[PDB]
Amino acid sequence: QPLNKYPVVFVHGFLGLVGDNAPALYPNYWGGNKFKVIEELRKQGYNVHQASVSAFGSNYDRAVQLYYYIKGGRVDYGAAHAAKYGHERYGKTYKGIMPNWEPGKKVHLVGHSMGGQTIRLMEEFLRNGNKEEIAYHQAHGGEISPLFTGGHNNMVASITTLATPHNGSQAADKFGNTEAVRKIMFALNRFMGNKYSNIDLGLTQWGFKQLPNESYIDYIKRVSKSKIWTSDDNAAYDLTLDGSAKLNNMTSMNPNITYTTYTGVSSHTGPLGYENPDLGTFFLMDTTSRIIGHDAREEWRKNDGVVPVISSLHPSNQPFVNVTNNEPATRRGIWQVKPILQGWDHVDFIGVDFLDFKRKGSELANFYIGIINDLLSVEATE
Amino acid sequence: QPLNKYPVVFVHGFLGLVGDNAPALYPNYWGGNKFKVIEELRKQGYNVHQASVSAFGSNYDRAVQLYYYIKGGRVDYGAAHAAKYGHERYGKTYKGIMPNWEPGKKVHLVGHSMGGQTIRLMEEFLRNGNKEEIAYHQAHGGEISPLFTGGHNNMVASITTLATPHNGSQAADKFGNTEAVRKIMFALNRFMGNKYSNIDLGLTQWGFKQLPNESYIDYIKRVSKSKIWTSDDNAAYDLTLDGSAKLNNMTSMNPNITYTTYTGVSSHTGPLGYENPDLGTFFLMDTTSRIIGHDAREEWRKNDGVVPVISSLHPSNQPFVNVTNNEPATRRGIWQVKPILQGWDHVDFIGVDFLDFKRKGSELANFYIGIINDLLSVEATE
Ligand SMILES: OC1(c2ccc(Cl)c(C(F)(F)F)c2)CCN(CCCC(c2ccc(F)cc2)c2ccc(F)cc2)CC1
Ligand SMILES: OC1(c2ccc(Cl)c(C(F)(F)F)c2)CCN(CCCC(c2ccc(F)cc2)c2ccc(F)cc2)CC1
Ligand SMILES: CCCCCCCCCCC(=O)O
Ligand SMILES: CCCCCCCCCCC(=O)O
Ligand SMILES: CCCCCCCC(=O)O
Ligand SMILES: CCCCCCCC(=O)O
Ligand SMILES: CCCCCCCC(=O)O
Ligand SMILES: CCCCCCC(=O)O
Ligand SMILES: CCCCCC(=O)O
Ligand SMILES: CCCCCC(=O)O
Ligand SMILES: [Ca+2]
Ligand SMILES: [Ca+2]
Ligand SMILES: [Cl-]
Ligand SMILES: [Cl-]
Ligand SMILES: [Cl-]
Ligand SMILES: [Cl-]
Ligand SMILES: [Zn+2]
Ligand SMILES: [Zn+2]
């Protein structure tokens, strides 16, 4: 019935809120008003979905959530993970977009920004499991999530990433992951865990959910004891250069998966060889673009607002091949890096820059239809 | 003590809120963060002031308020005016920036946008009075505001306008002054008349101030009978082509006043000869710029976001002379039209476009120093 035999799952990045988990007035993550990715692709008869996973959590936490988003069930972050980092083992429970998901029934994964990292880690778990969980269930017994077992292959057809910081970003290193702004992010999460809140910012496993009969002062006190304040099991850490490198060092190429990347630049070279944001860079990335663009290492300067070009092309120590925009992108086992999109900033990929008239809806529709056609190709060359 | 002999009064336009009358978080009208016109000019030893007058009111109402802002005392809109339009005769009372203002003690007036119209009308009243008020106090006796008497000359040295819609704007005609959006404006003013409100949006003379012991429902009921809902004694009407024409038809050149105008362009000609806003046009003017730029009459298309160039150069029926940037702007009695600032939109003149990095503080400082210099010149060529 659907033109695509494998469902496509779109996976948002850091700070991403989608569907019913957004504020009353909020941009629509996948396409803004420029091209309503989910609705429009569906009207054209494609089977597509937008995952909802932790906005502020680690790639680990998100990757677990992604699995349960697709498969359905109670999120299980793993007993060893929970014990090591100091957060609940069990999380939200998901209906499941594909309850029969198993070897043989594949899914296409496309990720924006951090979503690309999240996708890689989930596949890692499927294929290779999680060593610390395997080891913990070996020593202490009990039940272990199948997600952490390994040996589950032939479940993801493609991994396609848009402006993903495969190699991290200095914006995290020098801003996002600093003490003062982590405190802000966590305070936000605390607040939005209050008992009148309808949005889940993705750190409730750390205890940021006020109980219905608990005072806010008692909430604050309970939650000041959480390890979140000092942990590295969070998005801000994972987007640093170190944090991303760690994911790179523990991931590996699946020879059956079609891997493809897209990258945007929205900076321009200035007097001294530093990079500054283009007029038309969504203004919220003004400061981060300048931090990146003024890097000591020259090859780390060009950026889409928050992720350097080097970081988005491909994970740095994984195999890649520079590809053309016209040629079929059909190679398995290798990062097919599409040609840099000139003038696209980080958020132009998802169409929410309503300030930028150069980036039009028809363009964005072509981009997404572009990706679907590549995915159709992958299906046809099996 | 002050380098300028005559105080300079800056007069904000439509929707302008200044000083103690702005919300908690709000751009500073005169210079934004780019150049703090009042503070900086003062530091350089100039005597300058920012008037506070009705943000939503007619040019008439604002013009009266301007007078009392400068002179001090209880705003008197005039008995005939009040009776004809159906609003209170008396308004707020002002401390007075210049209590001794009289023929011989002059003041420089610079107006942004509608502020330019307001300034013209005030001077008209000083010089020629108000015929309706003269006639009404003739017939019915009582006291009459000196503002409406006429014969007060030699009180304003200069009238300088920035992006003033002397000939009105289609944005008013086809948006601002339509039924539905006038209702929205008036509802806003109603709401901000509530008993907890600390901002005056300028229509309280129409009854939009909830009494301390009145219910909101009774407030709504009382105020639904106001003529404001159907009146032309409001800003939206006055910024229309007709509305501005009427001011033009009742104003005339004072041969002792130095008149000077500035105009911005922030549109570009498209495929078919229509004008579209430049990237860099403050986004809130996106829709108005397109309305203006798609006008049938070609010469009405080029615009700064909300004011067409034809409208800002000079009142259409008054004398003008195209001037150069270097030409001392020292002629009395004629509209000295300064050369168009390319890429300045309506709000770049006041520096509140924080999105536009092309328009820097040092540029805006030069523009304002420029104006002061011209004013110093006027003083010295007496
Ligand atoms: O700062 C960001 C970032 C990204 C990656 C890294 Cl690595 C880092 C970090 F930490 F390293 F610095 C930071 C996160 C989000 N930023 C602003 C959010 C945009 C927002 C939006 C977009 C899509 C939506 F569905 C909803 C809202 C929005 C707001 C208002 C609006 F008028 C339009 C759009 C942009 C980038
Ligand atoms: O709509 C405007 C208009 C002007 C003339 C005519 Cl003729 C017409 C009409 F009739 F056609 F409708 C309309 C009035 C104000 N508009 C937007 C408000 C700007 C705002 C601002 C400006 C100055 C301040 F001191 C403080 C805030 C602001 C908001 C948020 C922000 F991040 C920065 C600035 C722009 C033009
Ligand atoms: C007549 C009482 C209701 C007014 C409508 C809403 C005003 C908000 C209350 C302001 C405040 O308590 O700070
Ligand atoms: C503040 C007076 C002019 C605003 C009219 C345009 C605002 C509605 C369009 C939506 C948006 O601002 O992104
Ligand atoms: C991040 C902004 C959240 C939207 C706040 C306004 C909601 C409303 O007035 O209904
Ligand atoms: C269309 C009316 C303006 C308010 C909604 C836009 C704010 C947002 O981008 O979330
Ligand atoms: C709406 C209130 C948000 C709380 C801000 C606290 C920030 C901090 O403690 O660093
Ligand atoms: C019009 C915008 C003003 C919002 C101010 C809210 C606040 O004080 O936090
Ligand atoms: C630019 C919009 C004006 C809102 C001012 C107020 O709500 O008091
Ligand atoms: C937070 C970004 C600006 C809000 C968009 C608007 O005022 O229409
Ligand atoms: Ca952009
Ligand atoms: Ca501008
Ligand atoms: Cl939020
Ligand atoms: Cl499974
Ligand atoms: Cl929640
Ligand atoms: Cl009030
Ligand atoms: Zn975790
Ligand atoms: Zn009036």
DSSP-assigned states of every residue in B103-168: TTS-EEEEEETHHHHHHHHHHHHHHH--HHHHHHHHHH-S---GGGT----S-EEEEEEES--TT-
Identify the residue whose C-alpha is closest to ligand 1 atom 6. A306
C-alpha angle B109-B111-B117 in degrees, rounded to nearest 5? 100
Q: Is there a contact between A328 and A377 (Cβ–Cβ < 8 Å)?
A: yes
Tokens at A343, concatenated: 């003038």
Sequence-distant (6+) residues with CB within 8 A of B143 are B137
**Residues A315 and A250: beta-carbon distance below 8 Å:** no
Residue B285 DSSP class: G
**Backbone dihedral angles phi then psi of residue A298, each to the nearest 5 degrees:** -60, -35
Cβ atoms A23, A199 nearer than 8 A: yes
Burial class, B92, CB count within 10 angstroms (exposed 0-12 / middle 13-18 / buried 19+): middle
- Contact call for residues B364 and B30 (beta carbons, < 8 A): no
Q: Which atom of ligand 6 is nearest to the CA of A23?
A: 10
Rounded Cα distance, B27 and B353, in Å: 9
Read off the DSSP letter of residue B174: I
Cβ distance A283 to B355 less than 8 Å, yes or no, reads: yes
A262: tokens are 């897209």
A124 contacts A114 by C-beta, under 8 angstroms:
no
Dihedral over Cα of A229, A235, A240, A242: its sign = positive
Place of tokens 């009774």: B218
B124/B110 Cα distance (integer angstroms): 16
How far is residue A2's CA from residue B338's CA, in Å, rounded to a whole number? 63
Placement of tokens 């203002």 in the chain: B101
Q: Distance between CA atoms of B366 and A116, rounded to whole angstroms?
A: 48
Inter-residue contact B109 to B11 (CB < 8 Å): yes
Write phi, then psi, for A185 (nearest 5 degrees). -65, -40
> How distant, in Å, are the alpha carbons of A11, A116, A252, A279, B54 from that of B126?
67, 69, 83, 47, 19
Taken in order B203, B205, B207, B209, the sign of the CA dihedral is positive
What's the count of helices (H) and strands (E) in chain B, helices before strands?
13, 13
> Half-sphere exposure of residue B188, counting CA atoms within 13 Å on the CB side?
13
The C-alpha angle with vertex A97 and arms to A166 and A14, in degrees rounded to 5, equals: 30
8 Å CB contact between A331 and A258: yes
- Residue A193 contacts residue A214 (beta carbons within 8 Å): no
Question: Crossing angle for the helix pair A114-128 and A241-250, nearest 10 degrees?
Answer: 30
Tell me the one-letter amino acid at B283. F
Q: Which of B277, B280, B354 sits opposite A279 (nearest CB)?
A: B280
d(CA A32, CA B48): 45
What residue in B sits closest to A283 (Cα-Cα)? B355
Task: Please give the distance of CA A307 from its chain centroid, rounded to a whole number.
Answer: 13
- Is residue B286 part of an annotated ligand binding site? no
Which residues 6+ apart lie within 8 Å of B291 measured at CB?
A: B170, B171, B174, B175
Q: Name B234's bridge partners.
A: B57
Residue A194 burial (CB count, 10 A): 12
Longest dimension (CA), chain A: 63
**SS3 (DSSP) at B172:** helix
CATH 3.40.50.1820 fits domain A1-382: yes
Closest-CA residue in chain B for A353?
B283
C-beta atoms of B280 and A283 within 8 A = no
End-to-end CA distance of chain B: 20
Task: Tell me if B279 and A357 make a contact (CB, 8 A cut-off).
Answer: yes
Read off the amino acid at residue A254.
Answer: N
CB contact under 8 Å between A358 and B283, yes or no, is no
The tally of CA atoms less than 13 A away on the side-chain side of residue B177 is 23
Q: How far apart are alpha carbons B46 and B38 in whole angstroms?
A: 9
Q: Check the CA dihedral B245-B251-B252-B253 and report its sign.
A: negative
Does the annotation flag B242 for ligand binding? no
Q: What is the resolution of this structure in A?
A: 2.2
Report the alpha-carbon distance of residue B375 to residue B382 in Å, rounded.
Answer: 11
Other C-beta atoms lying within 10 Å of the C-beta of residue B43: 9
Pairing state of beta strands B275-277 and B267-269?
antiparallel
Residue length of chain A? 382
CA–CA separation, B72 and B85 (whole Å): 24
Distance CA A372, CA A374 (A): 5
Distance, CA of A72 to CA of B302 (rounded, Å): 57
B336, β-bridge pairs: B260, B321
**Beta partners for B159?**
B109, B259
Q: And the tokens for A72?
A: 């359905």
H or E, element range at B31: none
Residue B88: count of CB within 10 angstroms of its CB: 12
Distance from the A356 Cα atom to the nearest Cα atom in chain B, whole angstroms: 7
Q: Determine the longest span between alpha carbons in chain B, in angstroms.
A: 63
- Taking CA atoms, A315 is separated from A253, A306, A310, A325, in Å, by 11, 16, 9, 20
**Selection from B79, B271, B311 nearest residue B172 by Cα:** B311
Q: Whose CA is nearest to atom 1 of ligand 6?
A: A25
| Residues A32, A352 contacting (CB under 8 angstroms) | yes
Three state DSSP letters for A2-24: CCCCCCEEEECCCCCCCHHHCCC
Ligand lying closest to the C-alpha of residue A77? 17
Q: Where are the alpha helices (DSSP H) in chain B?
A: 37-43, 59-71, 79-85, 114-128, 131-140, 170-171, 179-191, 216-223, 235-238, 241-249, 286-293, 309-313, 361-380
Rounded to a whole number of angstroms, the distance between the first and last alpha carbons of chain A is 19
Q: Is A272 in the pocket of ligand 5 (CB under 6 A)?
A: no
- Are A121 and A59 in contact by the 8 Å Cβ rule? The answer is yes
CB neighbours (10 Å) of residue A3? 12
Dist. CA B97–CA B114, nearest whole Å: 21
Q: Which residues of A are catalytic, by number?
A: 113, 304, 346
Assign 3-class secondary structure to chain A.
CCCCCCCEEEECCCCCCCHHHCCCCCCCCCCCCCCCHHHHHHHCCCCEEECCCCCCCCHHHHHHHHHHHHHCEEEECCHHHHHHHCCCCEEEEECCCCCCCCCCCCEEEEEECHHHHHHHHHHHHHHHCCHHHHHHHHHHCCCCCHHHCCCCCCCEEEEEEECCCCCCCHHHHHHHCCHHHHHHHHHHHHHCCCCCCCCCCCCHHHCCCCCCCCCHHHHHHHHCCCHHHCCCCCHHHHCCHHHHHHHHHHCCCCCCCEEEEECEECEEECCCCCEEECCCCCHHHHHHHHHHHCCCCHHHCCECCCCEHHHHHCCCCCCEEECCCCCCCCCCCCEEECCCEECCCCCHHHCCCCCCCCCCHHHHHHHHHHHHHHHHHHHHCC
Answer whether B37's CB lies under 8 Å from B27's CB: no
A91: its two tokens: 């999380």
Torsion on CA atoms B36, B38, B43, B46, rounded to nearest 10: 140
Torsion of CA A26, A30, A36, A38, to 10 degrees: -120
d(CA A6, CA A377): 12
Can you tell me the distance from the alpha carbon of A44 to that of A4, in angstroms, rounded to the nearest whole number? 11
In this structure, are residues A283 and B355 in contact, taking their beta carbons and an 8 Å threshold? yes
User: Exposure pattern of A87-98 as b/e (b: 16+ CB <10 Å)?
Assistant: beeebbebeebb
C-alpha B49/C-alpha B44 separation (Å) is 14
Residue A286 annotated as lining a ligand binding site: no
For ligand 6, atom 8: residue with the closest CA: A26
What token pair was written down for A11? Answer: 């996976």
In whole angstroms, what is the distance from residue B276 CA to residue B302 CA? 8
In sequence order, the 6+-apart residues with CB closer than 8 A to the CB of A199 are A17, A21, A22, A23, A192
**How much is the CA Rg of chain B, to the nearest whole Å?**
20
CA distance linking residue B182 with residue B226, whole number of Å: 14
Q: Which member of B277, B283, B357 has the closest CB to residue A279? A: B357
Going by C-beta distance under 8 Å and a sequence separation of 6 or more, which residues neighbour residue A217?
none
Q: Do A354 and B283 touch (CB under 8 A)?
A: yes
Q: Which of B279, B283, B354 sits opposite A279 (nearest CB)?
A: B279
**Which phi and psi (to 5°) does residue A260 adopt?**
-150, 140
Residue pair A258/A158 in contact (Cβ under 8 Å)? The answer is yes
Segments making up each domain of chain B, as ranges = 1-382
Q: How many CB atoms lie within 10 A of CB B245?
A: 16
Cβ-based neighbours of B74, under 8 Å, separated by 6 or more: B68, B90, B91, B92, B93
Gap between the Cα atoms of A216 and A219, Å rounded: 5
Which residues, 6 or more positions from A11, have their beta carbon under 8 angstroms from its beta carbon?
Answer: A51, A53, A66, A109, A110, A111, A112, A115, A116, A118, A119
Of A10, A17, A375, A6, nearest to A192 by C-alpha is A17
Distance CA B260, CA B374 (A): 9
d(CA A242, CA A238): 8
| Cβ atoms of A9 and A97 closer than 8 Å | yes
Round to whole Å and give the CA distance between B221 and B219.
5
How far is Cα B382 from Cα B376, in angstroms, rounded to an integer? Answer: 11
Q: What's the one-letter identity of residue A91?
A: G
Closest ligand relative to A75 C-alpha: 17
Distance from the B131 Cα atom to the nearest Cα atom in chain A, whole angstroms: 49
Write down the residue that tokens 């991290």 correspond to: A168
Spatial neighbors of B4 by CB under 8 A, at least 6 apart, are B46, B47, B48, B108, B372, B375, B376, B379
Experimental technique: X-ray
- For residue B159, give Cα distances in angstroms to A265, A362, B115, B237: 48, 48, 10, 23
Q: Enter the tokens of residue B111.
A: 């107006």
Is there an atom of ligand 2 within 6 Å of B113 CB? yes
d(CA B257, CA B251): 13
Q: CA–CA separation, B228 vs A15, rounded Å?
A: 45
